[PDB]
Amino acid sequence: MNTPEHMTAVVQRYVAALNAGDLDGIVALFADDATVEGGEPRSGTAAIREFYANSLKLPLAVELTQEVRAVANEAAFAFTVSFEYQGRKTVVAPINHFRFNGAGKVVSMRALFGEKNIHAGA
Amino acid sequence: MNTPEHMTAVVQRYVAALNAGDLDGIVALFADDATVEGGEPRSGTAAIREFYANSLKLPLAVELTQEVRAVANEAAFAFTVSFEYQGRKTVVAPINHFRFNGAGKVVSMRALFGEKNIHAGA
DSSP states (O other), X not given: OXXXXXXXXXXXXXXXXXXXXXXXXXXXXXXXXXXXXXOOOEEHHHHHHHHHHHHTSSOOEEEEOSOOEEETTEEEEEEEEEEEETTEEEEXXXXXXXXXXXXXXXXXXXXXXXXXXXXXXX | OOOHHHHHHHHHXXXXXXXXXXXXXXXXXXXXXXXXXXXXXXXXXXXXXXXXXXXXXXXXXXXEOSXXXXXXXXXXXXXXXXXXXXXEEEEEOOEEEEEEOTTSOEXXXXXXOOGGGEEEOO
């Protein structure tokens, strides 16, 4: 229609799909003309898949850390993305913003995080 | 310049000022031409003060609940606003977004929360 309930569900599908390294599943949440920006922008179904392709090279442990804020045509959520490389666990803690269209597809995704939000040992 | 460090500090001043019901303090964080949207939009120094005036009728207990995500010219943060009315404690749990200008003043504030994020008893 769409609704808070729907948008929260999409947020949750998104998180799950990242855990499952399920590219079809992620990309299917976006409109054909959606834009994606995680930081270097990217638009359209193809560019979006490539964006998440690079993201999923290492297996991701992804987790909502608070409730989803969903209202009108937007959703925002806090979460962590954890991965390991050369024996170092890294935890990135961003806040994402979705904008939905009438159909309930994500037409805009923005990831907000800075170096202060990247947590890892030596 | 501005920096993650600066933007986080402003977020923190903002939170503190809401606790102190310090209208000068809040409003001083925004540019002369800033816009504010907490939900019904409002723009300019005067409208912005009126917005927070209504917000501070009841005393607010405001608290950052996670680290601030600050990067480039934006900051986003999760927090709670608690107030009491007719013996019922209410806790609102939004995610806010600031956009800063070159001077380091907030030129845009957006509050994201839905009915699922308003928590209170009977």
